[PDB]
Structures are given as C-alpha cells and as structure tokens.
Symmetry: C2
Subunit: 347 residues, 2 copies
Amino acid sequence: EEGLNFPTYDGKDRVVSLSEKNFKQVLKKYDLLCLYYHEPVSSDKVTQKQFQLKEIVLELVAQVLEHKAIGFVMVDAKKEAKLAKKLGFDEEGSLYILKGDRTIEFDGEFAADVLVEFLLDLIEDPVEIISSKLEVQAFERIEDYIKLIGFFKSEDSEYYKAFEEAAEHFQPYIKFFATFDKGVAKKLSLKMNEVDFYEPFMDEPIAIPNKPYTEEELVEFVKEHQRPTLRRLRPEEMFETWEDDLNGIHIVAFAEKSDPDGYEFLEILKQVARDNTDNPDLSILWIDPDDFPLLVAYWEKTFKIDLFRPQIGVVNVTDADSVWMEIPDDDDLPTAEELEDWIEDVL
Amino acid sequence: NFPTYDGKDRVVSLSEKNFKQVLKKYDLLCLYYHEPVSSDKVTQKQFQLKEIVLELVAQVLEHKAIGFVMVDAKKEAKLAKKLGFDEEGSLYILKGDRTIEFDGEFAADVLVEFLLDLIEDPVEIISSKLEVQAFERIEDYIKLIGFFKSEDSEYYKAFEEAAEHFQPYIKFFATFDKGVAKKLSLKMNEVDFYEPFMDEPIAIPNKPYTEEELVEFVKEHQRPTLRRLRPEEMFETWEDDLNGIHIVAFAEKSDPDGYEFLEILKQVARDNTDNPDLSILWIDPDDFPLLVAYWEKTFKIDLFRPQIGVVNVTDADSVWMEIPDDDDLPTAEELEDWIEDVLSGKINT
Ligand SMILES: [Ca+2]
Ligand SMILES: [Ca+2]
Ligand SMILES: [Ca+2]
Ligand SMILES: [Ca+2]
Ligand SMILES: [Ca+2]
Ligand SMILES: [Ca+2]
Ligand SMILES: [Ca+2]
Ligand SMILES: [Ca+2]
Ligand SMILES: [Ca+2]
Ligand SMILES: [Ca+2]
Ligand SMILES: [Ca+2]
Ligand SMILES: [Ca+2]
Ligand SMILES: [Ca+2]
Ligand SMILES: [Ca+2]
Ligand SMILES: [Ca+2]
Ligand SMILES: [Ca+2]
Ligand SMILES: [Ca+2]
Ligand SMILES: [Ca+2]
Ligand SMILES: [Ca+2]
Ligand SMILES: [Ca+2]
Ligand SMILES: [Ca+2]
Ligand SMILES: [Ca+2]
Ligand SMILES: [Ca+2]
Ligand SMILES: [Ca+2]
Ligand SMILES: [Ca+2]
Ligand SMILES: [Ca+2]
Ligand SMILES: [Ca+2]
Ligand SMILES: [Ca+2]
Ligand SMILES: [Ca+2]
Ligand SMILES: [Ca+2]
Ligand SMILES: [Ca+2]
Ligand SMILES: [Ca+2]
Ligand SMILES: [Ca+2]
Ligand SMILES: [Ca+2]
Ligand SMILES: [Ca+2]
Ligand SMILES: [Ca+2]
Ligand SMILES: [Ca+2]
C-alpha cells in the first residue's frame, strides 16, 4: 500500500450505473452529484479493463468523500441518451458535477487524489472575501491562475450577488475574490462595484468596462478572455486544456519551477507572454514535469528531448509530432527575442 | 498516455552472491528492505501491492538504468548488515558510494519524481540574476549556498560531497561570481545555512569547511522550528517525533485563510526558532487529499479552515486549539501561549 493510514477500498458498492427513473431520487441524496458520462463499454477485453480501473478510482473517491455527501454514478451515453441530453452531457469521458442548478465539468487526470482535491474545492463557495493585509498578500501572490477581484459595499449588495453568481460558472478553475473594505479597495485601485481581471503572468489587470455589471456581463467578459497567453497544464485540467488547441497545435514549454534553470526559463517565457499578450492566436502551454512524473519517460521518448533541462517546442495534437528549439545548455538559455523569433516562424 | 504495467518481471529478490553483479548493472540501485514474507495472506498480499508499485516505477525508469531489487531482512540479514539497512519498510538507494533512504508515500508518481531528482547532481550553480532570484524564493526547504573560486577548488568539492549526504532533501547551491556573493553577502569559502521560513541565514563558523564540518553542522540543525510535511518524506518526518507528539498545523496555502494562518505561524517560528523542544509540522491538505477524510474523522476538525493542534503518535489522539473562525485567527502571542502550554504539558492528549 502507500503507507500508514492511506485509505483502502472497502469493497462496498457506492458507484452504480444510473438510469433516468432513479435520477431525481439519487439527486436528492447528496450535496453534490458526480456523473461519469461514458461511452458504452466494449465487450472487448482491453477496454473493459480500462473502464474498470476508472470505476475503481470513482469507488475510492466515493468512499473518502462519503461523509461530505458527494454521490458518484455512471451514465451510459447510448442507453441513457435522453437523460444525458436533458442534462446537456455531450462529451464522453468527462465527469459532470451537479452543484445546485449549476453544472461543472471535470476533464483531467482520472486519479483518486486528483479528483478528491478538485472536489474539495468545488464543495466550498467560489468567492473568497479579502479583508486583512495577509489576505491581500495572498491574493497578490496568485500568478498562474486567472483571478478576478471586485469592490462592493457588503455581502447584501446585489452587485456582489451578481459577481458571486458569475463566479459559480467557472468554479473552481477561475478564482473570484471580493472585498468590502475601503482600505483594500484603495490599495488594489478598485472603485465601487468595479471588477479587475488578472490574466496569468501579467503585471497589470484589466478593469472590466461599464460598471456596474450583471451576471451575464461578467460571464461574457471572462469567456472572451478565458484563454491566457501563457497557461499552465494542471493534472485536473490536462485534457480540457489539451483539447483546447489552436489550429491543431500547441506551443509546449517544459519548465521545472523548483529547478533554478526551470525557474529561469519560465521567467523568460513570462516576458514573451507579456510582449504578445494581445495575440489571440498565441497560447503557450507551460508544463512542469513535477506535476506529471509518470509522463516524463513518455515525453522524452516521444519528443526526443531531455526533461532535466527546460524545453520549448510545437506539438501537433493529431499524431503527437513535434519540432523543438535547440537548447543544449540551460546556462545559455535563449533571450525573449530569440524565443520570439523562433516562435514567430511557428505562427 | 499514462503508462500501465506490462506484466514483465523487473523487480526480483536480491541475494548476496548476486549483489555485486546486480550493482554493476545499473546507474542507480534501489533496494526495498522488507520484513520476511510469511506464510500468511497476512499478508503476502500487502507486500505484492508494494511490489506492483515498484514494478511500474522500474518500467518507466527502465531507459534510465534504474534498478529495483528486494532484500529479505531475514534471509539476507548479513548483506543487510553490510549495507547498513536497519529500517523495515524503507527503500534504500545506492548512488555511487552513498546510500539514500526513501521513507515516504509509496506511490509510483511520488517515487519517480523523487528518483528523477536523485539522479541529477546535488549542487546547483547560481550565476544569473534569475538564478539568484530562484534561490531566494526557496522558502520551505533547508538550503545552503557557498561562494568558491571555481569547480576545481577543494573547498567546493568538500561542499559538493557534503551535499551528497542529504540529497535530495536538503538543497545545496554554489556560486563562483563575486557579484552573486556580494548580493548574498558571502565571503570566499563561506557557506550560509538557511533554516526554512527564517529571514536570516546562519554563516557556518570556521571556514573553510571539510566534508565532515558541513555534514555535522547540518545534522545539528536538521530539524527546523517550522517544517513542512512532504509526501516523499512523510514517514521519515512523522517518525521524528518529540516526546511522542507532533504539533500539527493544517494550512491550505492556496486558500487565503490558510495562507493567512501560515504567515502567523512563521512569525511564531521566527520568535521561537532557538527552542530545541519546538518543531511545528505544517501540513497542506492539498498534498494529502486522500488523508483528509481520515484526518477530519480522527481529529474531529474542519480542514476547510486552518487548524493547529498536538497529535499523539501512539494512538493518533489529539487536542486542538479553538479557532472556530478563520476571520478571527489567533495572534502570534496567542499561538505562543497555546504552544507553550502544550510544551509544558498544560495541554495534553
Ligand atoms: Ca460499482
Ligand atoms: Ca460541452
Ligand atoms: Ca498522485
Ligand atoms: Ca488546487
Ligand atoms: Ca480549499
Ligand atoms: Ca475566507
Ligand atoms: Ca446561484
Ligand atoms: Ca482601477
Ligand atoms: Ca501586479
Ligand atoms: Ca454594465
Ligand atoms: Ca475530454
Ligand atoms: Ca471538455
Ligand atoms: Ca480540438
Ligand atoms: Ca538544473
Ligand atoms: Ca493575453
Ligand atoms: Ca509534484
Ligand atoms: Ca523535481
Ligand atoms: Ca542556468
Ligand atoms: Ca546563446
Ligand atoms: Ca516481481
Ligand atoms: Ca536506520
Ligand atoms: Ca519508516
Ligand atoms: Ca529535477
Ligand atoms: Ca543549473
Ligand atoms: Ca562523490
Ligand atoms: Ca554574511
Ligand atoms: Ca574549518
Ligand atoms: Ca527512516
Ligand atoms: Ca477559505
Ligand atoms: Ca515572543
Ligand atoms: Ca530553529
Ligand atoms: Ca495538489
Ligand atoms: Ca485545494
Ligand atoms: Ca481570514
Ligand atoms: Ca482572540
Ligand atoms: Ca509570548
Ligand atoms: Ca489519550
């Protein structure tokens, strides 16, 4: 096993296949209902096995999250097409979570620990209130996440409630914050009912025009600015991000942040991102090898690169074919301009 | 594209006749020192699960010549005595003349990430502006940096060899630039010791240093006042208890309230950094999501908020400081008073 006190599956059957007749009944039982929308299982032997692993994973997650009332069911895409269409499920292999009237999609690494950490954040309220100095400091240190902060009069303000409702659309991928403190608003240059949008790795936020905002206005603004120029590949978002390719390719950059050379290369990448942040056709994918250790060998074999050093290249999402910038020495890293010139030819 | 075990048998039991012949085969040799397998499902099974993990790691690290063997504590007690294996359940790694112990979460991804860092050279060279910046932003790791003339200096080589003792748990850095040394206030052959979450380093006395001087100084300062529980170090850290108890503080750093509480904890740690009876264990729930349910049930606490308490390592029993509101966090002084009462047995389990 993994160690002392790591949980083991108790054989109990908490995750079963869901039919439409029992939906409204199953839905009442839990705080959150997670539905694994899958394609009908082959008889084939090797897919049946690959599916069983996923259920085993869901079973373990259901066990450890039982006390927090999160239910897990499976939905056959073919046999239960009617239920799926009514709930709006159309992507197979995705885990849909029903939280109130809202629907959140999980499309990342199908592991027990990844799912649990993800769901634990999803349970809570999407908006964090920033009041103290250390809380302001906490907000300021968020770098690789899309974050929004608004200044409102109080929690009873209708303008805050609209901001809160908009936050529910993107939970927990995009972080929403709110303050009712004039001191904090002054420091963050926020006017009453004004909301600032922070793109990852950018120095200055964008004030959303024409305040105050309705729920729809905020959702629309975020959706139009939802793809950062430099975005990080996270295990809980990996397939969602990878399927969000631009013209069939990804500009992939490997950088181990804990490694001084990786940190070095990432900082140069940030500058490249800032210089071309207004390019809608450009989105650089930052992958920290430490977040995907079991894919390191695969990446080094497929991309023919050494992941002990920072790398950047262009990956074709159809056949996993790529060309990589020649960086044999991480003490002779390319400048922002040299990266840009190499990138410029890619576009 | 995540790998699955292909069924091949790469992890076998190692005997002493074949130790020499196996050691020559790999760049790194990992030996799982285990208790004797019994004639019970009591459990040959538990063991096999651990072997399955080792098999998957052996598969994905095959191209890098990383070997994995198993050492029976009974049948190979003499080899074990020769190699200095004495802890049951620990994974020992032979890197050249050195022996490194792994004593953390026995998972494939955890092991691979750990071993990948262990393969590389222990000392990172800090030269550029961004590299200096990279070193400075290291907060929760014990780190050392020294200023030397060059890589050919015997004083650097002593520093490098000393780094091999603690790889990859303690980070060693070196610079040969007077510009970096002036920024970091380093004199020639001087080495600064940075305790986690402290504002100021400690200049190791009596420079220059031999390998022995550095190793022994680190050993004397190897348990930080505020230390983080890491998956790859969790059991090593947990077994390093003081009087049967750990002062455990849960703080989700990504959460502003958890970040808030952690900063207060740093203040308490800095103010009481010279207390040898004090070592606070910081646990970020995001690093152990599969232990959240266990913790909430056993400790009777809400891990959606920052918590701090004293946990008894024998029966996992604990009492927790009352922080019902994370917008009314205790001050640094209130934390000290509560901690002092724990250390003085005024608050026990
Ligand atoms: Ca089942
Ligand atoms: Ca859709
Ligand atoms: Ca994992
Ligand atoms: Ca997270
Ligand atoms: Ca949380
Ligand atoms: Ca809060
Ligand atoms: Ca709502
Ligand atoms: Ca403004
Ligand atoms: Ca800024
Ligand atoms: Ca408006
Ligand atoms: Ca998908
Ligand atoms: Ca998707
Ligand atoms: Ca696509
Ligand atoms: Ca490096
Ligand atoms: Ca942009
Ligand atoms: Ca990691
Ligand atoms: Ca690493
Ligand atoms: Ca470098
Ligand atoms: Ca060059
Ligand atoms: Ca075997
Ligand atoms: Ca020992
Ligand atoms: Ca141990
Ligand atoms: Ca590394
Ligand atoms: Ca380096
Ligand atoms: Ca050596
Ligand atoms: Ca000094
Ligand atoms: Ca000396
Ligand atoms: Ca140990
Ligand atoms: Ca919170
Ligand atoms: Ca004091
Ligand atoms: Ca100390
Ligand atoms: Ca995590
Ligand atoms: Ca979290
Ligand atoms: Ca707070
Ligand atoms: Ca108080
Ligand atoms: Ca005091
Ligand atoms: Ca007791």
